[PDB]
């Protein structure tokens, strides 16, 4: 071999064409979202079942923030792009912000504390 | 007469909730409405003295239902000094220490919601 | 070889951090740090910021970021402009950390503070 | 100034003459203890109130392993040195392995999963 | 950018199996992908492996001649014994307690490791 | 007659618990005793086929109440009678369900286990 | 640490081989491949300085090639060369000399350098 | 303090607003010039007496290439910018390429081997 | 990014060194460096020591080493003890660089000097 | 491949089981020997023809100090171990300290300036 | 013959340690008041090879192929006769590579042999 | 009467050699003996004024044949009469004299300093 490369920046994990940041401590939705944006990323977005399986596996047993939000309980779920969610995995609860848990995806208020996952394309 | 919610403070015929969460004064009002409450309206010095002695985390500032929109309560009668110690611009009031202080409405602060019985 | 940080200070990589137990205005906080050959907290990377956010706990704390006015840029205590990685909240002149990230308040407002200096001799 | 120092190795935190390491994911007592030993450390020992305050604070709200064990419910609490614990902060529960929680110190099974704290002298 | 089904951690490229096998097949599988059974060189690498392996007891690149012989990597370089291996067997695997050992023929998930290179 | 515990598997007049925790065969026996149970004693092929179809995590090995000792030169159940026709090798080995077959492994190896309670 | 093999020189994380006789580009590239290496690649100023210093007075092939005079210079990886040190001459195969890097025909004879990571 | 900075890249020496590189082995003018150009630099240029004093002092007893050249013996000395030299320190010899020696500045053919100084603005 | 050393100073990695134009006693030399927000030179790696030995030319130059007596250990101006990598020649209290390495002399001896400070903000 | 190695520390060159260090500037025998000792090395020692060939090739055209010394002109040449030199390559001159030149090995006084070479086992 | 040149028959040879293009090789010989090497016989070639020492390098000679003539010509300037240039012909120049005369690109850097 | 060596200074019936090499006073005496000379014995202020005006490198200290010993409690020349104030400006312990600037200074005999050798013609 004559040269080595890296999949992603330091502290990030590479899964094919994506990079992911798994937080070391919990925070609210606002700080999380701000943190990802600073790294030229967004709160985690899964585009296929493989990406979702990776997130669920590596998130360990940490309830973790993802990039799904809704205007109200009567409004549709949207990504941080503002593109609507395909609703493949329905979200539990009657709140505006989505997080991953051991049962799948659940919801809470902007101000609750949770770990977060960032995502960006390599 | 109905009783105060499970983990709220009780005084006279009022229920108080002191938040651990902070945001803008506008966002503070929104949290009280979601709770079926309003921002704090101090009726007398006795009510204030009670709240201060029941806060514990005296090292934080708390939004109240008073804003320079002159100075008006959210109920919404004009304020009478009989005193907001600070500076006036496009300000909102907050309990900072043992005094009512005027701060920027964009600042992140905790708040006190109140429910009338 | 290493060099333990002083009493009441936390050590994080090549820096040394002091988290106050009492609140003050921004002017006193800045004066306090300068007396310890330090400055109000400066974060240069994500690791340093993660530290500050994690250890500050539930204490809204002063960091070394200021503005001349709402229409002026944010500056460190060095007077070097802010990289604006984490955009500060509010329309006020003096920055501090909270659970939402970095917000702002007036001169006179009281908050706890963070000092920061390089571990050096 | 003409020399810079670090107080602790990379990923560790310095408080006076001690270095602390806070886990990134949870594990059981056996792996946690093995991890610390590999870094020429032990599961977190708090000598004074200042050291205990820091641990409780920096650990966020994560139930984290500390170096206190007992042979059985009827046996005294000992450190990993095998020096007996001064019992300043009494440990809750009737289990053999101590861990920090929001209430103070509690007890669980060797197999329970918890975030951990490694500690060593600088 | 690591190949499909592989995870990138720093300058290394890791493969976490979906189906289990013996130590002989596992080693053969990794070699076919221009890789070897996982080697951890630092705490960060070991933490990743332990975290992502989930609840799957997975083979790593550590083998013994006998219970009285030292543990060697697939390079044939001896193991620094930082994390002592449990059991009195010749082939090691990662579990929730750390590292354990079994016989050549037992079925377990595996982990392949290679440098992200050209 | 009393029913199986809250989150245990029920089959015939037996209760099963599949551990998520792994250790030596000796430590497996200790966990079943603490639970007021014993290691798994497979009565028939029907019982085995049931367990395999109800495990889900089929990709992990599980200790059972069967061990080989030099003193007897035979495979004995922990109840404790000799085994009658384990695909593997015999030395100072303990049995475990690895895949869809009973395998002989080293008793020092870390493995999960199946506890059983008789009704 | 881990010493480079016999006849090789270790410079940081790389192992270099300087031939004892000359040969055509094709045999040299084949010789390096046999030692799990490739014709010499330099990634920094330090690596290039080493090569230039130890190359001595031997014109030596390196991993740079070109499809034609109108095509870009590429490494054996097929990654294009950053052209920090432009190669002199209008030929397809590059070699190190005292004037820097020059080009010649696949069939001309030169000394050679291999390169591989210490792994 | 707060953070530390570098005046110049690794292996380069900083003198006011300039960076200088001193070779570790000798080479002809062609390679020496090529080397500097690859680092977005040129064969040393001194603009004042302080810069020249530094070069003379740090070059030790190594006859070194600087960025002065001439078309022929009857042509003026020029920098790599093609700006003419101020001739403050006259160059010895009747050759086309300048180098620093223990006496001051001398000249030789393109092919001779010497050490070399690179320079560039910080 | 890259930050230039002041006039008459030489930049080597993250440090700024100053080489005197005249000799003096150790006391004045130490006082001169302090005036420039610096200290009598300290080398932390082989590269820093190589630079000092190379640029000091043929000038015996004061560095930041001292010791209380012949029987006392060598310390830097930080009061941190020296790693003794290059043992100091002589049975005296104040160190200076020469062509043989590092030797020692009395506080009132005239040597040339070298300062050093971090290129820090 | 799945791990990276080095063979020698930074600035050293690996030849078989040895690590040679070639200086960047000249000094006397005393400082040169002191420099090597500080890196847990000694002035260069060649044990075979291959080691000597490497030294002569990489030393370029620099007269470089090595690890051979003798009490007087009438005394035998010894290594820094104090083991006697096999006299395979006879040393030129009637002086006490050896150094490598383009002709082979020559000798001078302790005080003369030369480049140097350190060697230590990997 | 000059002070540090090789002597054979009624010819002087200089083997360069310096390398460049064939054009630049010709320029160096002219500056020396010499010309590039013209091999008269196999005896002269065998002598040069046995007196080179650095046999592991290639050396330009006074032989080049031009499209205008479609032939190999010496710089004296006689067309070449097989009495053998082992390589390929395009816009090439000859060089002693090993123990044989090889055709190489004239832009390649190579040492040279001057003759007087 | 025979003349001074090839590159030595000549004054009255004395030859001087100023070293560029530095060492202990003991090692300075050894170098003069190897040269068939002795350390400098200043006969008068005229001889001193000559040496100072012929040094050039006034920024260095030079050993002379004058030392203080506890056995005599006096300053003695190496010839070896006792010194007379006809002035050594410094401190006396186990000291040796050296020309530092335009004055004779008492220094530690272990310090590295250059020296002045002298040869008598008579
Ligand atoms: C509004 O609240 C204040 C006390 O906060 C009280 O004095 C005032 O009477 C209230 N206004 C009305 C209309 O009740
Ligand atoms: C022990 O268990 C086996 C089934 O695992 C059974 O066939 C045997 O009869 C049992 N022995 C006794 C004494 O019940
Ligand atoms: C040109 O040189 C060749 C030998 O290199 C020789 O055979 C030929 O006769 C020469 N031509 C002339 C005109 O001398
Ligand atoms: C010793 O030297 C001093 C001058 O340095 C001189 O005055 C004295 O007479 C000399 N002693 C003898 C015995 O010559």
Residue numbers in the entry:
A (entry chain P), D (entry chain E), H (entry chain F), J (entry chain J): 73 to 194
B (entry chain Q): 91 to 159, 164 to 176, 180 to 214
C (entry chain A), I (entry chain D): 76 to 196
E (entry chain O): 79 to 196
F (entry chain X): 91 to 175, 181 to 214
G (entry chain I): 77 to 195
K (entry chain U): 94 to 176, 180 to 212
L (entry chain S): 91 to 176, 180 to 215
Excerpt from the publication:
In mice, the NKR-P1 family consists of five members, which include three stimulatory (NKR-P1A, NKR-P1C, and NKR-P1F) and two inhibitory (NKR-P1B and NKR-P1G) members. Of these, NKR-P1B, NKR-P1F, and NKR-P1G recognize host-encoded Clr molecules, which like their receptor counterparts are C-type lectin-related type II transmembrane proteins that form disulfide-linked dimers via cysteine residues within their membrane-proximal stalks. While the expression of most Clr molecules is tissue-specific, Clr-b transcripts have been identified in most tissues except brain, suggesting this molecule may represent a broad marker of healthy-self. Indeed, downregulation of Clr-b has been implicated in missing-self recognition of virally infected, cancerous, and allogeneic cells.
To understand the molecular basis underpinning recognition of Clr-b by NKR-P1B, we expressed their corresponding CTLDs and determined the structure of the co-complex to 2.9 Å resolution. The crystallographic asymmetric unit comprised eight protomers of NKR-P1B and sixteen protomers of Clr-b, which together formed eight highly similar NKR-P1B:Clr-b complexes (root mean square deviation (r.m.s.d) ~ 0.5 Å overall Cα atoms). NKR-P1B engaged Clr-b via a head-to-head docking mode such that the N-terminus of each molecule protruded from opposite ends of the complex. Surprisingly, a single NKR-P1B protomer engaged one half of the Clr-b homodimer, making contacts exclusively with only one Clr-b monomer. This unusual trimeric 1 NKR-P1B: 2 Clr-b stoichiometry was conserved in all eight of the complexes present within the crystallographic asymmetric unit, and differs from the 2:2 stoichiometry observed for the related human NKp65:KACL complex, despite similarities in overall docking mode. Unlike Clr-b, NKR-P1B was not observed to form a classic homodimer, most likely due to the orientation of the α2-helix, which protruded in a fashion that would sterically clash with a neighboring NKR-P1B protomer. Instead, two symmetry-related NKR-P1B molecules packed together to form a distinct non-classic homodimer. Within the crystal, two trimeric NKR-P1B:Clr-b complexes were bridged via an NKR-P1B dimer to produce a hexameric arrangement Here, each of the Clr-b N-termini lay planar to each other, indicating that these molecules could potentially be arranged in cis within a single target cell membrane. NKR-P1B and Clr-b interacted via an imperfect interface that was modest in size, burying a total solvent accessible surface area of 1450 Å2, and characterized by poor shape complementarity ((Sc) = 0.55, where 1 indicates a geometrically perfect fit).
